[PDB]
């Protein structure tokens, strides 16, 4: 939410940078301050001065990617889920880690099978109204965000049906995250 | 650097610790023989730590200890077989070769088997500081000529009589193939109870671990024996021979025949058969073919030879087997003449 | 090679054009890379990468230029062939290319120039199609060939060709002459023999090639009457056999020219010899023969496992066969 | 750098692309109907319209007006299609890639279904490059791929491309483009361009575009680049090395004159300018063809050697058919064999030599 | 759509020709002369496979072992449905590994779980690595008395001789335009889809004995169109005319025509149709004529009635002429590349034949 | 049901078992029985020599339970063990995964281990030529200074991929091709003893048909048998030989030379009927002509392996003068370039052949 309205600039930082920056935050350092320049930006954190030339070119869209009607609210605990999810993947598809979900309403249900025999099953809870979300996605992606999600009530806004599910912190909206289903 | 002939390897081996006993030569029988003699006497000489480690064309190098006082968990000198690159040690190699020369080569008693080095390698510093301590053992093969001699001494390796009548026939037919000839004498010795060579006996069973050279055919051709040469080839087939070889070798002789035919039709036969080459025995066959083979009729033949060569070699037509039947008679022109459409 | 003066005007247009973005960022310079294209190319990058600054300069100054001079210009690439090959592989390509999707990395435009695009590979080339066609930002691509023939068409669909013939023979000779002593006939004989390309013309006088040219020339004059060609095996038997094979051809051809009445020769480095060919040989067979000289020249290059010699020899005999009657005398076709 | 036209000349509708109606129609037609294959094979010359028919189709599938004969211009999906980014659509150059590796990965992502698209449409071009394995791997999903997924194959050549692949595509063979189809389209194009076109050059280019609209278009960009503005004849005739001269017949004649020198000295200078041999060759050949034709009928020709028609005629009749065939033949073989010569200049000399030796 | 796939065979019914191979299969299925190994080689039109599923389904049912043209029980049905257990289909994709072969070797050990025999089935084997070939020498050499390996190798050439010495070879061969034509009609009658025998012929002709391919072509006709299989769509998207055109011209050349020939020259140039198609077309006919010279035999399937033009031509045209021309033509073909143009080239080669006509060449002065 | 499967035995499973390949078998036992055995050896030779069948016999006499005998020992179960892997002292250690340097290191940590049954460690390493350069440093270690107990028994069918050092290092025995009679006889008695019906001629056919390999002989019997209802029937073997073979050029050569009209076409049609490449068929014809043309410039032309067909080649040759041979040859050669622009090579060929007619 914070920031300024103060101009954004093509500040497309790489992959690496963001890491050190991220590093330059933690509570620690000074607060992170930015001169967002297209040019470069000039970041202030630690005894450093971290500065990129920026790759200048667009950064692909990010509003569309939100599910089509992410709306069923799958208020779960990010953690529990993150656990359950972790377990389920094992005898889920072992390739893409594409767990398939059939979140029983208000509960949850998950049915995973690793093609290669086996199957994993969970029963968890998600305050989820609206009929089974019946969407599977790459659990490999997911957990990542659960965990980058410091928020532990994460409401998912899905459109129940093998379509994108937005997950956001339920608790704020900061972290809003979208992954996409697997196969059709 | 001292060149030694394998049979005299003991001279330098024994007398003193030669650093790099460099068995450059190529007769495998000779190389093998020069290798094991150093080793044997090396292993005996407290260098039992004996390892083989090639020197790739690759920079290679590994055990470059040559003194460091690292051991006393397993102290001793060791010895290091280097199989050389194609032409010998290259850079990196040369380098780390020149290092060893520089040091006690302690624990790295050099045994460099290989081949003849390249010149620049031999002028390359490493091959400069080995000198005077190393031993080059020429492991190069007999001429046709020295071949019987050798062969004859070599008989007594097997102690069996051998027959020099046979020796020759071995020297020709195994002209230049010491190793297999050595094994030749072995298979048959076993095969009989007696295992005594002599020519009659070596006819009855012939070592099927030792080749019947192109010569038989081509020479048969020299003569003009346009059937003889042909038969040897029926055999050269069942035998599976790569045609390349036959071509190669045939090419060798025939181009030699051209050139000698240019100068021969006015220069006594066979002198030139050895003023160049053309074995002794061939020389006759060969002095003939110049007279038989008049350089002109000879031209079209080359044109077919080339033809086949290309058929093979660019085209990988494996019908060169049939192309030759033409050529035999195209070249020979029969034992007489009988030159015909090319193929 | 080196930058020669005759690379400049090409450059200017191109940079002009480039600067005007009329000049397409692509570019193809026919001219031998032997007749200067490389330096010309790189002269361009020199500028182009530093963003094209000044109207047209090779850039002596510029950070781009100098960092490109240091080469450390990341923008900068030299993009030679791959060395695990010797042709400019796909991979080589894949890289530099993809680095340009990260924009400029130290500014100025990039210039990513192939040294001799003549030297590209196919996975490389195929790879390069889309990049040479499609313009990435600040990219000025610069390619070099012996001749345009050094490249594929689909590529050239998009090559903004900036032709560049050899400079004229005269100049190509004067240019050639400066640097190799031996008569302008040898310069020219050679130059001419080079399809008039200098860069190409020059090489001849190096080595014992042009001396062997002569050498060869001599043995042959003996060969020809004598019907011993076989003498020539060596004169032409060489790593430059094809070249020596080439030395020879241009004379055979000169003899057929005499066979069409034609003073004109491409080896003006001796006309006597030329005459005698025609002289001892009917054109039919001269002509037949001329074919084959190259053909061997080809074969020496084409046949796997081919005895250079074997081939050099067969030929002599066979010539020798032709000089001879009855021995049917071709003319080349079917 | 600096922009091209070729692309910029790529369709939005069937018209932008000249020809292949069988395909245009085949396309308009497919599209409109449920005759949407998730396997298409556009096989035509590089941007003849192998790539153009693909574009139309794309917009039409991811026409946000469904599947439509024409791609219903604008649709977001349609207009972004020819712009960067467009999730439904994922396009590919299998050129840079040769690896199978590249081929494997590709099959995996079809799963992820857009969070808003309507056919995850796949466009492979330059597939030929890819290795065998790369090829064979595609058969699997050409047959039954997951839904939305498509396989618009465009190929220059479906030849480095197995039977089974073709067996498993709609192959809309885009046939080639008539010089005129080209000239025209160009003529149309260039003129739209501010810079004065240049007919001569238009033709110079029309024939020169090599049946591919893309190049055609390319040429042009390039002609401007080095003509620094404006298409003019000369810059293009020269640019093209093209001899708008009758030197073809000149030499033919001088061969016939038994004239050695004239024929030869002329080529050599031409070689200092490196002048195109072929151009020169094709022409000679043609004349001969016609002349003989002029023998057949000095009318039933569909000859365009009219300026010299009389010359043709003249030749045609005076020289027996036979010999005409024969001239024609000699040089045809020499042309064949021209390149073979290590100066280029050398190969043509041979051709003519042999002609000149024929007379 | 994939009518190529869809229409594939599955019963003995769906196997055209190779009745000998069916008869044999039926037969060897009756008296136990079944050997472990079978080896189907042949075209991708009949499918190497189809005939295998038929064998398979004939090797095990759930009604014992009897030859069966069609599914029964499950086993057979399955088998053909690509559902049977002992089925174990052997193919390739990006797959070209050893590991694949291994498994097969392993089930040999096993006795059929549902089958009366284990019923493995390869398609074509030639994409796999060197190893897997040899791996089979072993198991093949000595196989269980309850595991059947039904090999298929389009070419038995791929397969080693020791195992091949042992194999019951069956070869599938190519299918006629007529049979194909006969077919496509039938199939297009099942999925009633318009066609015209000429379009069918044009198609049936273009297919390359691969019904599967004949079906690929029919597919892009239907799509080039909107489901039609008219001659234009077909002839255009195919780039091919009809023999008559040529024939009419040929009748023109023989007859030395220069205008007629010029005409049909242009006729061709006008249909946005190919120049050597013609050349080709012409050499074929020459030959046919010439065939018809010797026996009242050998005439086309794109002529059901221009037989007479042929008979005729065979009769009236001295053999000599027929060779000259076929020849003049053939050279056209080869040289056509260096031609300054295919049409000219085409034009010029006919000028040649005629300039050289063994009737008379062009006006010769 | 594969019925009988004889392509597993009747390669040398005993020192005497197979009556072809004696060249090796004889010196093998004189060496072995006697103590004059080497540390290391080499086997080679074409398949069906029982390539391996030899190495295994060597280990048995080392490891027999009748000492070091080359004497058969069947009551010696060592001996039986040895013929299988079962013998501890026989290691059938292969070579197809012993090709990295580490694969071989291990085998040498086991050259510190004595014959636990036999009297030689016999490491039977077969088909060797697959090893990396590094692997080849390390095997030589136990040769150069040799550990006797281990015997390394090497089989290959490519002795070239093993360095001169190693070769010089090893004693090589070379196994040859089996001849018509070798095979025939081996079978004749073996099947005579195996209670198997051998219609003699089937042998000679099969014997003739494949010479070089004993193994082959039995694989072919296996099909012959399946087709012969358990029997090596001449019917079976001719049948089998027909499956795998068709000659359409000899017949064609005859028909085209005779100027038979429709036999040529008939044949061309048959040649299409049971397909044959038209190009290959051209070439198949070409070669026949040459063969006759050579039978006329040398009976030697027909090599000894050609005895089988000499009679007809001879006779074709002699019914035809060679000029006409080179005339048709000329025609064929030309035909051969027609196939490509030939609208069909069958036609191309038929067209070609209809030209041969005119020269009869």
The Cα C133–Cα C159 span in angstroms is 8
The answer to whether the beta carbons of residues E196 and E185 sit under 8 Å apart is: no
Domain boundary among D240, D262, D279: D240
Q: Considering D200, D223, D240, which residue would you say is the last residue of a domain?
A: D240
Q: Where exactly are the structural domains of chain B? A: 1-142, 143-213, 214-311
CB D332 within 8 A of CB E338: yes
Cβ A57–C105 below 8 Å, yes or no? no
CATH number at residue E200: 1.10.8.60
The partner residue sitting opposite B309, judged by closest CB among C228, C302, C310, is: C310
Residue ending a domain, choose from F178, F198, F230? F178
The total of other beta-carbon atoms located within 10 Å of residue D124's CB is: 20
Residue D50 known to bind ligand: yes
Tell me the C-alpha distance between C132 and C88, whole Å: 15
Of the candidates B309, B303, B319, B2, which has an alpha carbon nearest to the alpha carbon of residue B134?
Answer: B2
- Please check whether residue F330 touches B, CB under 8 A: no
Chain C residues within 8 angstroms (CB to CB) of chain B: 228, 230, 299, 302-307, 309-311, 313-314, 317-318, 320-321, 324, 327
Please name the fold of domain B214-311: Zinc Finger, Delta Prime; domain 3 (1.20.272)
User: CA D104 to CA D141: how far, in whole Å?
Assistant: 12
Closest CA to E362 of E254, E265, E258, E250: E258
Q: Which of B304, B335, B333 is nearest to B228 (CA)?
A: B335
Task: Check residue F146 and give left, alpha or beta (phi > 0: left; psi -120 to 50: alpha).
Answer: beta
Q: How many CB atoms lie within 10 A of CB D45?
A: 22
Give the residue among F175, F243, F176 at the shortest CA–CA distance from F209: F243
Q: Give the distance from residue A62's alpha carbon to the nearest chain D alpha carbon, in angstroms.
A: 11
Q: Is the dihedral of CA D66, D70, D73, D79 positive or negative?
A: positive
* Distance from the F227 Cα atom to the nearest Cα atom in chain E, whole angstroms: 7
CB B138 within 8 A of CB B21: no
For residue D337, what are the β-bridge partners? none
Distance CA F13, CA F80 (A): 10
Helix (H), strand (E), coil (C) string for B170-231: HHHHCCCCHHHHHHHHHHHHHHCCCCCCCHHHHHHCCCCCCCCCCHHHHHHHHHCCCCHHHH
CA gap A179, A149 in Å, rounded: 14
User: Do residues D173 and D205 share a domain?
Assistant: no
Are residues D116 and D229 located together in one domain of the fold?
Answer: no
Residues D36 and D170 in one domain: yes
Q: How many CA atoms lie within 13 Å of E89's alpha carbon, on the beta-carbon side?
A: 14
Q: In terms of domains, do D165 and D68 share one?
A: yes
Q: Determine, for residues D111 and A96 on separate chains, whether the beta-carbon distance falls below 8 Å.
A: yes
- E131 and E203 inside one domain: no
d(CA B24, CA B3): 9
Distance, C-alpha B271 to centroid of its chain:
24
Q: What are residue E338's phi and psi, to 5 degrees?
A: -85, -10
Strand partners, A75: A127
Q: Which CATH homologous superfamily contains domain B1-142?
A: P-loop containing nucleotide triphosphate hydrolases (3.40.50.300)
Say how many residues make up chain F. Answer: 360
Phi first, then psi: what are they for C251, rounded to 5°? -70, -45
- A49 to chain C, closest Cα gap in Å: 19
**Residue D89 to residue D77: CA distance in whole angstroms:** 9
DSSP conformational letter for D278: H
Torsion of CA D92, D94, D96, D100, to 10 degrees: 120
> Which residue has tokens 């070239």?
F160
> Cα–Cα distance between C244 and C216 in angstroms, integer?
8
Do E108 and E180 share a structural domain? no
Domain check: are F19 and F147 in the same one?
yes
Chain A positions in Cβ-Cβ contact with residue D111 (cut-off 8 Å):
96, 98, 181-184
Report how far residue D154's alpha carbon sits from residue D126's, in angstroms, rounded to the nearest whole number.
Answer: 7
Please give the Cα distance from D8 to D12 (Å, whole number).
10
* Same-domain pairing of E327 and E266: yes
Three-point CA angle E197, E203, E205, nearest 5°:
100
Separation between Cα atoms, residue D163 and residue D157, nearest integer Å = 12
Q: Which residues of F207-239 are buried (b: 16+ CB within 10 A; e: fewer)?
A: bbbbbbbbbbbbbbbbbbbbbbeebbbbebbbe
Both tokens of residue D150? 């498509």
Candidates D126, D260, D274; nearest CB to C261: D260
Please tell me the distance in Å from C139's CA to the nearest CA on chain B.
Answer: 39
Contacts of A68 in chain D (CB under 8 A): 115-116
Is C334 buried (19+), middle (13-18) or exposed (0-12) by CB count in 10 A?
exposed
Joined together, the tokens standing for residue B254 give: 């025939």
What residues of F are designated binding site for ATP? 45-52
- Residue C144: its H or E element: strand C139-144
E166 φψ region: left (φ > 0), alpha (ψ -120 to 50), beta (else): alpha
Would the annotation count D75 as a binding residue?
Answer: yes
Strand partners, A98: A138
Residue E336 sits in the same domain as residue E257: yes
Q: What is the spatial distance between Cα E13 and Cα E11, in angstroms, rounded to a whole number?
A: 5
Task: Say if residue D47 carries a ligand binding annotation.
Answer: yes
Interface probe, candidates B238, B241, B338, chain F, greatest F C-beta count within 10 A: B238
CA separation for the pair D319, D327 (Å, rounded): 10
Do B339 and B300 form a contact (C-beta atoms < 8 A)?
yes
On chain E, the residues whose CB falls within 8 A of the CB of F2 are 35-36, 142-145
DSSP sequence for F140-190: THHHHS--TTEEEEEE-S-GGGS-HHHHHHSEE-------HHHHHHHHHHH
Query: Domain of D257?
Result: 242-359
Asked if C303's CB is within 8 angstroms of B299's CB, the reply is: no
Residues 6+ apart with CB under 8 A from A69: A159
Tell me if D175 is assigned to a ligand binding site.
no
Q: What distance in Å separates the CA atoms of residue D16 and residue D9, rounded to the nearest whole number?
A: 7
Backbone angles phi and psi of E137, in degrees to 5: -55, -55
Cβ–Cβ under 8 Å, residues D174 and D50:
yes
- Chain B: residue nearest C326 by CA? B296
Sheet with A98-101, edge to edge strand ranges: A119-122, A110-113, A98-101, A135-138
CATH value at residue F97: 3.40.50.300
Which residues 6+ apart lie within 8 Å of B73 measured at CB? Answer: none
Q: Which two tokens stand for residue F134?
A: 């590094």
**In Å, what is the CA distance from D290 to each residue of D257, D285, E256?**
20, 9, 17
CB atoms within 10 A of CB B100: 25
- The residue written with tokens 């060679």 in the block is F322
**b/e map F142-181, b = 16+ CB within 10 Å:** bbbebbebbbbbbbbbebeebbebbbbbbbbbbbbbbebb
Q: Please, are residues A50 and A11 in contact by the beta-carbon 8 Å criterion? A: no
Instruction: State how far Cα A161 lies from the chain centre.
Output: 19
Query: Based on the domain organization, do E45 and E147 belong to the same domain?
Result: yes
C306 contacts on B by Cβ (under 8 Å): 309-310, 313-314
How far CA C176 is from CA of C5, D125, D268, in Å, comes to 14, 47, 18
Return all residues near F176 (Cβ < 8 A) that are at least 6 apart.
B208, F21, F23, F24, F45, F46, F49
- Smallest CA–CA distance, residue A12 to chain C, in Å, is 11
Which method, experimentally, gave rise to this model?
Answer: cryo-EM
Tell me which chain E residue has its CA closest to the CA of residue F273. E173
Asked if A56 reaches chain C (Cβ–Cβ under 8 Å), the answer is yes
The DSSP secondary-structure symbol of A76 reads B
F322 and F200 housed in the same domain:
no
Give the sign of the dihedral formed by CA F235, CA F236, CA F239, CA F241: negative
Return all residues near E95 (Cβ < 8 A) that are at least 6 apart: E127
Residue C296 to residues B306, C323, D65, D333, E232, Cα–Cα distance (Å): 11, 19, 65, 20, 51
User: Into how many domains does chain E fold?
Assistant: 3
CATH number assigned to the domain comprising residue D271: 1.20.272.10
By DSSP bridging, strand B3-4 and strand B135-138 are: parallel
The two tokens of residue B268 are: 């006594």
CB neighbour burial string for C197-227, b if at least 16 within 10 angstroms, e if fewer: bbbbbbbbbeeebbebbbbbbbbbbebbeeb
Fold of B143-213: Helicase, Ruva Protein; domain 3 (1.10.8)
Half-sphere exposure at residue A103, Cβ-oriented, CA atoms within 13 angstroms: 30
What is the C-alpha to C-alpha distance for residues D130 and D160, in angstroms, rounded to an integer? 9
Answer for the pair C236, C216: CB distance below 8 angstroms, yes or no: yes
- Chain E residues with CB inside 8 Å of F99's CB? none
d(CA F155, CA F93): 12
Burial environment of residue F97 by CB neighbours within 10 A (0 to 12, 13 to 18, 19 or more): exposed
Chains B and E touch (3+ CB pairs under 8 A): no
Query: B330 touching F, CB under 8 A?
Result: no
F100/F203 same-domain check: no
Resolution in A: 7.7
D251 contacts in chain C (CB < 8 Å): none
């Amino acid at each position: 939410p914070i920031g300024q309205s103060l101009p954004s600039h093509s500040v497309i930082v790489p992959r690496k940078g963001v890491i050190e920056l991220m590093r330059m935050l933690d509570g620690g350092d000074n607060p992170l301050r930015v001169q967002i320049g297209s040019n470069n930006i000039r970041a202030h954190v630690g005894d450093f001065i971290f500065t990129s030339k920026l790759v200048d070119g667009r950064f692909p869209d990010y509003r569309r990617v939100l599910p089509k009607n992410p709306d069923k609210h799958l208020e779960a605990g990010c953690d529990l889920l993150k656990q359950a999810f972790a377990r389920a993947a094992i005898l889920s598809n072992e390739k893409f880690r594409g767990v398939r979900l059939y979140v029983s309403e208000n509960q949850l249900k998950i049915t995973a099978n690793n093609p290669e025999q086996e199957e994993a099953e969970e029963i968890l809870d998600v305050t989820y109204s609206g009929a089974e979300m019946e969407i599977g996605f790459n659990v490999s992606y997911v957990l990542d965000v659960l965990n980058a999600l410091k928020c532990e009530n994460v409401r998912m806004m899905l459109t129940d049906s093998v379509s994108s599910v937005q997950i956001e912190d339920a608790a704020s909206q900061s972290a809003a995250y979208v992954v996409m289903p697997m196969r059709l | 650097m001292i060149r030694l002939y394998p049979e005299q390897l003991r001279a330098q081996l024994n007398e003193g610790l030669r650093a790099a006993y460099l068995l450059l030569g190529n007769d495998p029988l000779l190389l093998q023989e020069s290798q094991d003699a150093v080793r044997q006497v090396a292993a005996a000489q407290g260098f039992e730590e004996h390892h083989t480690f090639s020197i790739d064309p690759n920079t290679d190098w590994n055990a470059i200890f040559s003194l460091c006082q690292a051991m006393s968990l397993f102290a001793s000198r060791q010895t290091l077989l280097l199989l050389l690159p194609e032409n010998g040690p290259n850079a990196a190699i040369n380098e780390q070769l020149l290092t060893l020369t520089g040091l006690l080569h302690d624990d790295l008693l050099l045994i460099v088997r290989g081949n003849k080095l390249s010149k620049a390698q031999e002028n390359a510093a490493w091959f400069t500081a080995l000198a005077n301590r190393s031993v080059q053992v020429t492991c190069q093969t007999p001429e046709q000529a020295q071949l019987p001699r050798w062969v004859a001494a070599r008989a007594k390796q097997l102690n069996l009589e051998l027959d020099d009548a046979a020796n020759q026939v071995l020297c020709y037919c195994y002209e230049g193939n010491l190793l297999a000839l050595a094994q030749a004498l072995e298979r048959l010795s076993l095969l009989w109870p007696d295992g005594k060579l002599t020519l009659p006996r070596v006819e009855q069973a012939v070592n099927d671990a030792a080749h019947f050279t192109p010569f038989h055919w081509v020479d048969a051709l020299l003569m003009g024996k346009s059937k003889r040469a042909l038969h040897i080839l029926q055999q050269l087939r069942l035998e599976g021979s790569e045609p390349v070889i036959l071509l190669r070798t045939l090419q060798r002789e025939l181009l030699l025949l051209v050139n000698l035919k240019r100068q021969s039709a006015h220069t006594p036969l066979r002198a030139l058969f050895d003023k160049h080459r053309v074995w002794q025995n061939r020389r006759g066959m060969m002095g003939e073919a110049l007279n038989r083979l008049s350089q002109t009729q000879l031209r079209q033949a080359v044109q077919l030879l080339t033809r086949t060569e290309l058929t093979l070699k660019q085209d990988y037509g494996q019908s060169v087997w049939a192309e030759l039947e033409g050529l035999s008679l195209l070249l020979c022109h029969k034992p007489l003449a009988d030159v015909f459409i090319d193929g | 090679m080196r930058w020669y003066p005759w690379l400049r005007p090409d450059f200017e247009k191109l940079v002009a054009s480039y600067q005007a973005g009329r000049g397409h960022h692509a570019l193809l310079i026919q001219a031998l890379p032997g007749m200067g294209d490389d330096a010309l190319i790189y002269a361009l990058s020199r500028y182009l990468l530093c963003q094209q600054p000044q109207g047209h300069k090779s850039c002596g100054h510029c950070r781009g230029c100098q960092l490109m001079q240091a080469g450390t210009h990341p923008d900068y690439y030299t993009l030679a062939p791959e060395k695990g090959k010797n042709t400019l592989g796909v991979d080589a390509v894949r890289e530099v290319t993809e680095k340009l999707n990260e924009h400029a990395r130290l500014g100025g435009a990039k210039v990513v120039w192939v040294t001799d695009a003549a030297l590209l590979t196919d996975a490389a080339a195929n790879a390069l199609l889309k990049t040479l066609e499609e313009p990435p930002a600040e990219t000025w691509f610069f390619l070099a060939t012996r001749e345009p023939e050094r490249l594929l068409a689909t590529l050239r669909s998009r090559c903004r060709l900036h032709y560049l013939a050899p400079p004229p023979e005269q100049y190509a000779v004067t240019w050639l002459s400066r640097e190799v002593t031996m008569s302008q006939d040898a310069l020219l004989a050679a130059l001419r023999l080079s399809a008039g390309s200098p860069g190409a013309a020059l090489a001849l006088f190096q080595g014992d090639n042009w001396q062997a040219r002569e050498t060869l020339c001599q043995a042959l004059a003996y060969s020809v009457p004598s019907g011993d060609w076989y003498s020539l095996l060596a004169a032409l038997n060489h790593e430059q056999a094809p070249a020596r094979l080439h030395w020879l051809a241009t004379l055979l051809m000169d003899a057929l020219k005499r066979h069409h009445g034609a003073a004109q020769v491409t080896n003006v480095d001796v006309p006597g010899l030329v005459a005698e060919l025609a002289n001892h040989l009917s054109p039919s067979r001269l002509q037949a023969i001329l074919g084959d000289v190259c053909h061997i020249r080809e074969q020496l290059m084409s046949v796997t496992g081919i005895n250079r010699e074997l081939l050099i020899t067969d030929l002599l005999l066979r010539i020798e066969h032709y000089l001879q009657p009855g021995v049917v005398l071709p003319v080349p076709h079917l | 750098s600096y922009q091209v036209l070729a692309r910029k000349w790529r369709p939005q509708t069937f018209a932008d692309v000249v020809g292949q109606e069988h395909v245009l129609t085949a396309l308009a037609n497919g599209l409109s109907l449920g005759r949407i294959h998730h396997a298409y094979l556009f096989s035509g010359t590089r941007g003849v319209g192998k790539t153009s028919i693909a574009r139309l189709l794309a917009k039409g599938l991811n026409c946000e007006t469904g599947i439509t004969a024409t791609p219903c211009g604008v649709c977001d999906n349609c207009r972004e299609i020819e712009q960067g980014r467009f999730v439904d659509l994922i396009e590919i150059d299998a050129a840079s890639r040769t690896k199978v590796e590249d081929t494997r990965d590709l099959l995996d992502n079809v799963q992820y279904a857009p969070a808003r698209g309507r056919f995850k449409v796949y466009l492979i071009d330059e597939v030929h490059m890819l290795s065998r394995h790369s090829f064979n791997a595609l058969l699997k999903t050409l047959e039954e791929p997951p839904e939305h997924v498509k396989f618009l194959l465009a190929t220059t050549d479906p030849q480095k491309l197995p039977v089974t692949i073709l067996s498993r595509c709609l192959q809309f063979h885009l046939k080639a483009l008539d010089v005129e189809q080209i000239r025209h389209q160009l003529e149309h194009i260039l003129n739209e361009e501010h810079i004065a076109h240049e007919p001569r050059a238009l033709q110079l280019l029309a024939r020169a575009a090599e049946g591919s609209l893309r190049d055609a278009l390319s040429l042009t960009d390039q002609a401007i680049a080095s003509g620094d503005g404006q298409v003019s004849t000369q810059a293009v005739s020269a640019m093209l090395g093209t001899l708008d001269d009758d030197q073809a017949l000149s030499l033919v004649e001088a061969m016939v004159e038994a004239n050695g020198e004239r024929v030869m000295a002329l080529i050599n200078e031409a070689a200092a300018r490196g002048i195109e041999w072929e151009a020169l060759l094709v022409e000679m050949l043609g004349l001969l063809h016609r002349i003989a034709m002029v023998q057949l009928s000095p009318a039933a020709l569909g000859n365009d050697m009219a300026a010299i028609e009389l010359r043709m005629r003249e030749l045609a009749r005076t020289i027996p058919p036979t010999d005409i065939q024969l001239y024609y033949q000699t040089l045809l073989i020499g042309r064949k064999e021209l390149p073979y010569a290590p100066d280029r200049r050398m190969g043509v000399e041979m051709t003519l030599l042999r002609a000149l030796a024929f007379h």
